[PDB]
Amino acid sequence: QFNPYGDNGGTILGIAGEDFAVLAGDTRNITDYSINSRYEPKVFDCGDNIVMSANGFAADGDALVKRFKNSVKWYHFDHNDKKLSINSAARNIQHLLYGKRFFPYYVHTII
């Protein structure tokens, strides 16, 4: 039987400071007991001073990040180049994720 999901490992960490924020992640990508890559970037600058990482199944992680970056682009088109605030970005990502409620993006997302 075909299993649409996989586990690419990895670990990410977000910490909010007083006037700053960090989003960190290891650069290792794996399946089972093998290393795919020792440097595969996992944390991404998505524009509008927002950083994102979708950890877990890397194919779903890449798809989600790609669609969010795209959502930032179309937010600028549709709303006169307005900056997408972090709270608005968060609510938008909820809808991206829940859109596939019955076939989920197998990832744990942090922005």
Partner 1 sequence: DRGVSTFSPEGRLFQVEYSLEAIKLGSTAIGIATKEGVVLGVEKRATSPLLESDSIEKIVEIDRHIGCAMSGLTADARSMIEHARTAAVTHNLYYDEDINVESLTQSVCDLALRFGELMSRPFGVALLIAGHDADDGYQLFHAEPSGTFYRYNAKAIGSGSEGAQAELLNEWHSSLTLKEAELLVLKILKQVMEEKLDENNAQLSCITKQDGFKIYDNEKTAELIKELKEKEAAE
Partner 2 sequence: NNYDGDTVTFSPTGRLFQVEYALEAIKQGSVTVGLRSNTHAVLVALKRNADELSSYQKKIIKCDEHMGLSLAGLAPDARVLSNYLRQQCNYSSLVFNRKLAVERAGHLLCDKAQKNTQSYGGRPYGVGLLIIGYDKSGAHLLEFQPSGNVTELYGTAIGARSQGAKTYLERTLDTFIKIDGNPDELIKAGVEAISQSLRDESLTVDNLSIAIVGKDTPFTIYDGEAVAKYI
77 binds partner 1 (CB under 8 A): no
Name which of partner 2, partner 1, none residue 91 binds, using a CB cut-off of 5 to 8 Å depending on partner kind: partner 1
79 binds partner 2 (CB under 8 A): no
Block residue for tokens 């970037």: 41
Paired tokens of 109: 């997302």
Name which of partner 1, partner 2, none residue 14 binds, using a CB cut-off of 5 to 8 Å depending on partner kind: none
Contacts of residue 40, defined as CB under 8 A and 6 or more positions apart, other chains included, come to 27, 28, 29, 58
Name which of partner 1, partner 2, none residue 38 binds, using a CB cut-off of 5 to 8 Å depending on partner kind: none
* Binding footprint of partner 2 on the chain (CB under 8 A): 66, 70, 73, 77
